[PDB]
Amino acid sequence: ENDEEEYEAWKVRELKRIKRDREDREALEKEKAEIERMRNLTEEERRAELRAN
Amino acid sequence: AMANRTVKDAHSIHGTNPQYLVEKIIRTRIYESKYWKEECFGLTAELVVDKAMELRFVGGVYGGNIKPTPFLCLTLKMLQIQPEKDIIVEFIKNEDFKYVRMLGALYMRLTGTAIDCYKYLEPLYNDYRKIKSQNRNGEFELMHVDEFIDELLHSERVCDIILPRLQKRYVLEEAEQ
């Protein structure tokens, strides 16, 4: 009965938790992607240098 | 004083004596307490089982005299005797006693591997049962299990213990093979 609203109150808490964890996760995803992009850029330029000279 | 020392067989946790995860003055206030002197005499995991089932609330210390709650006393006792992972996991998995569950959870958060922390604490997010919480003032507040679990996984301090640094799950996953 009334504890159905206790389950509802939990849902909301869990959704706040999910939103927060999702934002942190994306922020760190974006960082790792950036690092890796730089690493790839470096490797491509290294190979380019060797072919060139 | 000897009965308050960390058991002979115990290994180090987070580079130190497991009891030292709790502040020096907090330990001292625990050893001095009525609850510890009467209810925590003994070095056995079964003691912890029996007393844990008698827990009515979560908390750390309260008052400007820094008095320990039973919850915190049992936590120190657990650091001191270093029970085996099986019992802690049983504490956690048990569905009948919420305070036992939370006691096992805090201990897992304090002493477990990053992996074990997520593995065993995260499913407890489903547990939304009401719990009694004694704040720093000595006031009793309503709380919910999953909120305690969230505090264990995202706070610096719970029950007046500074939580050992815990890697974010995404980093441990990116570390996975």
Side-chain angles (χ1 to χ4, degrees), chain A residues 1-52, chain B:
Chain A
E1 35 194 300
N2 53 263
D3 59 73
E4 194 65 40
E5 288 148 350
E6 176 83 341
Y7 175 80
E8 295 291 331
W10 168 78
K11 269 173 154 201
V12 177
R13 271 182 270 122
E14 184 66 4
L15 282 164
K16 290 192 212 160
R17 231 138 40 195
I18 289 168
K19 183 199 172 197
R20 177 256 266 120
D21 289 339
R22 182 144 265 257
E23 285 170 357
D24 298 335
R25 189 186 172 84
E26 283 167 17
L28 228 78
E29 266 178 78
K30 168 186 179 173
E31 289 186 338
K32 261 65 154 64
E34 184 49 56
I35 300 172
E36 255 225 288
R37 177 162 184 245
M38 296 185 186
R39 295 208 182 99
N40 294 342
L41 191 51
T42 287
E43 290 162 33
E44 280 161 25
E45 276 152 350
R46 188 158 159 81
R47 76 134 59 80
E49 273 186 280
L50 290 90
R51 266 101 96 103
Chain B
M2 204 170 315
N4 287 347
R5 273 194 277 271
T6 300
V7 294
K8 284 281 185 162
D9 338 319
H11 57 256
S12 59
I13 303 295
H14 295 293
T16 190
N17 183 325
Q19 291 201 75
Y20 299 172
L21 297 181
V22 183
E23 311 292 353
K24 228 294 171 67
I25 40 87
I26 297 182
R27 302 201 301 271
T28 314
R29 289 312 306 249
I30 292 163
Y31 301 145
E32 286 166 4
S33 66
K34 186 144 137 53
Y35 179 86
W36 176 274
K37 284 181 178 171
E38 284 158 33
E39 310 294 308
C40 300
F41 182 60
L43 305 171
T44 190
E46 205 176 327
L47 190 167
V48 182
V49 185
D50 297 338
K51 301 288 157 176
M53 280 144 42
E54 286 159 32
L55 291 164
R56 289 278 83 203
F57 57 86
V58 305
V61 298
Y62 62 98
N65 31 244
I66 306 185
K67 280 164 192 157
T69 57
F71 197 87
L72 179 61
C73 296
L74 285 187
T75 311
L76 189 81
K77 175 57 65 184
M78 283 187 280
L79 293 160
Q80 173 193 14
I81 67 175
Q82 208 168 73
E84 294 193 37
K85 193 182 162 197
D86 289 344
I87 333 160
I88 306 316
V89 170
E90 195 53 47
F91 273 23
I92 284 160
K93 303 235 285 164
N94 117 90
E95 309 176 328
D96 304 301
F97 305 96
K98 56 196 171 180
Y99 300 107
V100 172
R101 161 169 274 180
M102 261 145 22
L103 191 64
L106 174 57
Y107 184 79
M108 179 58 89
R109 178 58 179 83
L110 294 177
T111 64
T113 69
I115 296 145
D116 285 347
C117 282
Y118 290 112
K119 195 185 283 166
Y120 294 117
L121 307 182
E122 224 151 64
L124 305 187
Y125 276 133
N126 292 325
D127 188 349
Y128 57 96
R129 287 130 89 209
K130 294 186 181 79
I131 56 149
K132 206 166 173 175
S133 174
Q134 198 179 47
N135 62 40
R136 198 65 172 72
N137 311 312
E139 285 252 289
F140 291 98
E141 298 181 353
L142 173 71
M143 198 171 277
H144 304 257
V145 179
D146 60 304
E147 288 170 325
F148 185 80
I149 296 308
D150 196 53
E151 282 174 349
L152 285 174
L153 292 164
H154 299 294
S155 298
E156 290 173 1
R157 174 193 313 265
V158 172
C159 296
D160 292 294
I161 309 169
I162 298 169
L163 300 183
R165 195 198 180 101
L166 172 77
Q167 311 249 23
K168 283 178 182 172
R169 210 210 311 158
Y170 179 83
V171 183
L172 253 286
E173 286 166 337
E174 281 302 301
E176 197 185 320
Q177 192 196 357

